[PDB]
Amino acid sequence: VTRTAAHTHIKGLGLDESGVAKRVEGGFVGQIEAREACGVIVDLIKAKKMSGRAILLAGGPSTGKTALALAISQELGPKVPFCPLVGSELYSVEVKKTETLMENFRRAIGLRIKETKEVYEGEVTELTPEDKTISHVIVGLKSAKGTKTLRLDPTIYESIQREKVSIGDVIYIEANTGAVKRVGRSDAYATEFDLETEEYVPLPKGEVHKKKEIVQDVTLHDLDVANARPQGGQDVISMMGQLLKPKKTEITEKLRQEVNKVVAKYIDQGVAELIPGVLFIDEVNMLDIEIFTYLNKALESNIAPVVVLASNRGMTTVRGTEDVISPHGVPPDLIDRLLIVRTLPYDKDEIRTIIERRATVERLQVESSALDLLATMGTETSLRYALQLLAPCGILAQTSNRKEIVVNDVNEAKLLFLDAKRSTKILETSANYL
Amino acid sequence: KSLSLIAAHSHITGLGLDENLQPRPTSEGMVGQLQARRAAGVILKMVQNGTIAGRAVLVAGPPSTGKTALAMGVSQSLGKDVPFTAIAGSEIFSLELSKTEALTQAFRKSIGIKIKEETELIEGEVVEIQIDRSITGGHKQGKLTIKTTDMETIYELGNKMIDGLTKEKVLAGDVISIDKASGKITKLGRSVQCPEGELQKRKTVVHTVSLHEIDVINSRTQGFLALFTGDTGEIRSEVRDQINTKVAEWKEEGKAEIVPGVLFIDEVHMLDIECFSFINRALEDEFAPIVMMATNRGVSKTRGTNYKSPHGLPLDLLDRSIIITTKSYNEQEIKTILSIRAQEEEVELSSDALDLLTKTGVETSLRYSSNLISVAQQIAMKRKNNTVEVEDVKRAYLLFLDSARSVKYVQENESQYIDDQGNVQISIAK
Amino acid sequence: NFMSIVNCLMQLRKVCNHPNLFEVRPILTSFVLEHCVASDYKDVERTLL
Ligand SMILES: Nc1ncnc2c1ncn2[C@@H]1O[C@H](COP(=O)(O)OP(=O)(O)O)[C@@H](O)[C@H]1O
Ligand SMILES: Nc1ncnc2c1ncn2[C@@H]1O[C@H](COP(=O)(O)OP(=O)(O)O)[C@@H](O)[C@H]1O
Ligand SMILES: [Mg+2]
Ligand SMILES: [Mg+2]
Ligand SMILES: [Mg+2]
């Protein structure tokens, strides 16, 4: 019914209008500074003015950095574009990591447009040249409420020849795009043959010419791929244009200058509205020194929005460097333009509320003795081992036909499943590399 | 209407120097660094002179000094019609393109060529259109009347005039402007239009094109598709040699004049030694633009070798280059820079918030205060007043932590964070 | 009025059973960007060639 995978219990940060964060609100217990400061970051994205700001989230495991990342991604809403990304994913062999990094900086930003398109539909009456010719075809579309004849290009006529239409077939033709879809044979010719593979559709109601306006949103990187390589078409020249060089290449700066030039012309006409977004990079310590040094100049660039990082290390060696020792795996020049939000750990009662609220979201019933036992396992092995063992206790409750988690079920979970320190303690004694 | 939101490098507009090249204290967004702005003005009049070439310069210094902001001031004071190429040091590393040929591509991208010619234009109001064709044969015969304030005549049209006149919809009320050499029609206005002047006028058109564009165009036909799609690389040098002799012949004939542009390379410390020796040869070529470099690292080991060379660059590069250095700023100049960032960001600040923000800008860094000025207006904005208070700066200080403070927090919590060997205490007890 | 109430509720009654509110679902065809950046430089290709 409802799939829960270490998430979906958080519906945002849950802050007040004054700013003060509650103790128990929105799937969060404790962590006041990262939630309230994270809401300051939420308003900072809602400013639509700031750019180049980089805020890393540094902390230990089971502390709530990625959960805070889903808290800001849920607090922003669907209208603000969110780009999840891992630093291990930026390595590519088709192009460099620079093109994927700056390309992702063009993936964070969004831009909503509004445009009107013309819709034509009707039953095909005549396909004939004009009177003399170079071979164009007047297509007489018979609609219900009107009958009109229209002259078309040879390419859309070629797609009309592709759709195998004839006299008396309902088609769908778009003016600005040129795409052709056939609905089927009209209902007037259903009695011509007793059995036919072509389905019989009724006549389309309404006029021949129709107009509507869409508030469709499309990312600026999608306009960059639309400016980079040919995608598809229904003709041979467009499909071979796709088939010839479909391998993605690096993009020059002048192309982005013309893209945001005509985009700036669209925002000068009042049509579109520029809204920034979020590029969230997971495991920043796995990045190379080249991506760090291009992040130095990339954060000095203009269009780079509020980028949130997540690094789970300290004074370690940077990847790509031999003797450089720096905090968080980040070079000190990039760490100078970074902002650190320290994550706070959780007590025994806060582990009890994590297991409690995770149990209520997981729709399992836990008794108080098993809740205190899972609290002691939360303060003995790990948090992820108790949250990992919430489900097998309910499974053993289902096999034992019980509706609540008991002491013998979680002790049977202790016997059937082992944690880290029992695994290391068992693997310490070896006959032949146990 | 160059696209301009609030950048770190948006307030700097021009170098801001006098006629005697002595820099003012507060001029055109740049405050301080008198010797760096004066020497950068010597580079500015070096590009504006254009009689010399093949020179490399370097701008060095500690962080929070603005060497990239100084080169931004040079590029902003350079003005239009002069090409400026700003590339990264790690941008030359590519898989489809070699690093040396990409560096040669940047060296061809830096210098442009101005070529001018004259064309004729007939602009005037249409009175009526009377074409003549045949129902079976063809061979269209067009006639229309063109009118202005002091001329009104009937123009007979050819085949291509009715081809462009019927492929583009036009009326009697609609007004056209026809070029004779191009053959395309400009349907400008209908009866915007309100025209004056003579009917047929001749004006000059000037086009600016860099040498790299001529290199990939004269490489092959699909080098234009590689000019847009970016799938170029590794051009044969016969195009470069014959294009150099053709450009020199265009300079000798007086047909094409060239503009010496500036090549700016950011983060030049992590560059390969092959590109270093390639710059060591390419600085002595005839068509060699002025190169400005910004070495950002310190003394370390160069990539490609084992020894720790000083400056991060070999001495063959630094022998043929001039070096400008920058120094740290005073306490008053940080308050002045935060004041002009308050003027750029349109943020009204108080005196005590500027004093405490100046103190925490001296203590921590320039960039942290340059972002605390941004968030302080929004902690103030949540209180529904435009005035920034000291409580917003203190809250923005306790919320957004410095790097050294969380370095102390990391060193206090090393059991929480994962170590170099992958060991991490994810539990609390035992 | 009493007519604007019923004439306002007949749209929601024209929504809850079946979306008969003019029923136009967009066909989601591509964008109509007509600029074609290369055509602004095609004349430069003509002058250089
Ligand atoms: N304050 C909190 N309240 C509720 N659950 C939390 C909290 N902090 C962490 N968690 C839970 O811990 C789990 C793992 O944490 P995670 O975000 O993966 O840590 P990290 O970001 O260090 O990898 C998440 O599924 C999340 O539900
Ligand atoms: N002379 C100056 N005038 C105005 N701002 C400056 C100046 N020098 C440095 N800055 C500030 O320094 C910041 C960028 O420093 P940067 O040029 O990146 O240093 P580096 O090049 O050493 O990394 C900018 O936000 C800018 O406001
Ligand atoms: Mg994580
Ligand atoms: Mg720099
Ligand atoms: Mg030499």
For the domain that residue B160 is a member of, what is the CATH number? 2.40.50.360
Structure tokens at B97: 């393109």
How many Cβ atoms from other residues are within 10 Å of residue B238's Cβ?
10
Say how many C-beta atoms besides its own lie within 10 A of residue B151's C-beta: 13
Inspect the interface and report whether the beta carbons of C49 and B209 lie closer than 8 Å.
Answer: no
The full 3-state SS of B306-324, as one line of letters, equals CCCCHHHCCHHHHHCEEEE
Chain C residues within 8 A (CB-CB) of chain B? 37-38, 41, 43-45, 47-49
Look at phi and psi of residue B297 and say left if phi exceeds 0, alpha if psi is from -120 to 50, else beta.
beta
Minimum CA distance residue for ligand 2 atom 4: B30
Residues in chain C with CB shorter than 8 Å from the CB of B209 are 44, 48
Taking the C-alpha atoms of residue B300 and residue A318, their distance in angstroms, rounded to an integer, is 14
* Terminal Cα distance for chain C, rounded: 73
Residue length of chain C: 49
From B12, B58, B55, B54, select the one nearest B39 (Cα to Cα): B58
The data reach a resolution, in angstroms, of 3.6
d(CA A192, CA A169): 13
Rounded Cα distance between B393 and B354, Å, is 9
Spatial contact of B364 and A340, defined as CB atoms under 8 Å apart: no
Token pair recorded at residue B428: 């609390």
**Chain B (398-417) residues lying within 8 Å, Cβ to Cβ, of chain A:** 399-403, 405-407, 409-411, 413-414, 416-417
Experimental approach = cryo-EM
Selection from A153, A9, A18 nearest residue A67 by Cα: A9
Among chain C residues, CA nearest to A210: C24
Contact C26 A212 (CB under 8 A): yes
Is residue C18 classed exposed, middle or buried when 0-12, 13-18 and 19+ CB atoms within 10 A define those classes? exposed
Q: How far is A258 from chain C (nearest CA, A)?
A: 7
Encoded amino acid at A184, one letter:
G
User: Which conformational region is residue C42 in: left (phi greater than 0), alpha (psi within -120 to 50 degrees), or beta?
Assistant: alpha
Our answer on whether the CB atom of B32 is closer than 6 Å to any ligand 2 atom is yes
Strand ranges (E), B8-166: 26-27, 30-31, 56-60, 84-88, 112-132, 141-147, 152-157
Cβ pair A54, A43 in contact under 8 A: no
Helix (H, G, I), strand (E, B) or coil at A270: coil
| φ/ψ bin of B346: left (φ > 0), alpha (ψ from -120 to 50), beta (otherwise) | left
Would you call A317 and B420 a contact, using CB atoms and an 8 Å cutoff?
yes
CA B16 – CA B31 distance, rounded (Å): 9
Distance, C-alpha A80 to centroid of its chain: 11
Contacts of B252 (CB under 8 A, 6+ apart): none
Q: Which two tokens stand for residue B172?
A: 């009697």
Ligand 2 atom index nearest CA of B69: 17
C-alpha to C-alpha distances, A337 to A225, A296, B402, nearest whole angstrom: 30, 9, 10
A62 is in an annotated binding site: yes
Q: Where are the alpha helices (DSSP H) in chain C?
A: 3-16, 37-40, 42-48
Distance of CA B124 to the CA centre of its chain: 39
Residue A84 main-chain phi, psi, to 5 deg: -75, 140
Asked if residues B42 and B9 have their Cβ atoms less than 8 Å apart, the reply is no
Smallest CA-to-CA distance from A167 within A121, A126, A200 is with A126
Q: Tell me the C-alpha distance between A170 and A200, whole Å.
A: 9
3-state helix, strand, coil in chain B (%, to 5): 40, 20, 40
Minimum-distance ligand to the CA of B277?
A: 5
Which domain, by its residues, includes B181?
116-205
Q: Is A117 close to C30, i.e. CB distance below 8 A?
A: no
Cα distance between residue A32 and residue A19, in whole Å? 10
Residue matched to tokens 């101005």: B114
| Token pair belonging to A51 | 């750019």
Choose from B4, B95, B406 for mutation: most chain A CBs within 10 A: B406
Judge contact between B128 and B155, C-beta under 8 A.
Answer: no
* Residue A302 to residue B9: CA distance in whole angstroms: 9
Q: Does B229 touch chain A (CB under 8 A)?
A: yes
The residue assigned the tokens 């507060």 is B26
Question: Which of C43, C45, C47 is nearest residue B224 as measured by Cβ atoms?
Answer: C45
CA distance A422 to A428: 10
- Smallest CA-to-CA distance from B399 within A353, A392, A257, A341 is with A341
Q: How far apart are the first and last CA of chain B?
A: 64
Instruction: Determine whether the annotation assigns residue A399 to a binding site.
Output: no
In the reported structure, the alpha carbon of residue A338 is separated from the centroid of ligand 1 by a whole-number distance in angstroms of 23
In angstroms, the CA A252 to CA B260 distance is 22
How many A from CA of B55 to the centre of ligand 5?
Answer: 14
Tokens of B152: 């009104």
Alpha-carbon span B405 to B411, nearest angstrom: 10
Tallying the residues shown for chain A, one arrives at: 434
Q: Compute how many other C-beta atoms are within 10 angstroms of the C-beta atom of residue B47.
A: 20
Task: State yes or no: A261 annotated in a binding site.
Answer: no
The partner residues of B202 in beta bridges, in order of sequence, read B120
H helix runs in B345-416, sequence order = 351-363, 366-382, 390-399, 403-412
Residue A210's H or E segment, with its range, is strand A209-214
Residue with tokens 């609390």: B428
* A197 belongs to an annotated ligand binding site: no
For residue B389, give Cα distances in angstroms to A43, A49, A137, B334.
19, 21, 73, 19
Q: How many CB atoms lie within 10 A of CB B142?
A: 19
Unique residue bearing structure tokens 């760490």: A335
SS3 B37: helix
Determine the straight-line distance between the first and last CA of chain A, rounded to whole angstroms. 42
Identify the closest residue of chain A to C31 by CA–CA distance: A177
In the reported structure, the alpha carbon of residue A218 is separated from the centroid of ligand 3 by a whole-number distance in angstroms of: 29
Q: What is the dihedral of CA B338, B344, B346, B352, to 10 degrees?
A: 10
Q: Which residues are CB-contacts of A35 (< 8 A; sequence separation ≥ 6)?
A: A13, A14, A15, A21, A28, A68, A71
Put residue A329 in one of left, alpha, beta given phi > 0 → left and psi -120 to 50 → alpha. left
Which among A379, A399, A123, A113 has a CA at the least distance from the CA of A263?
A113
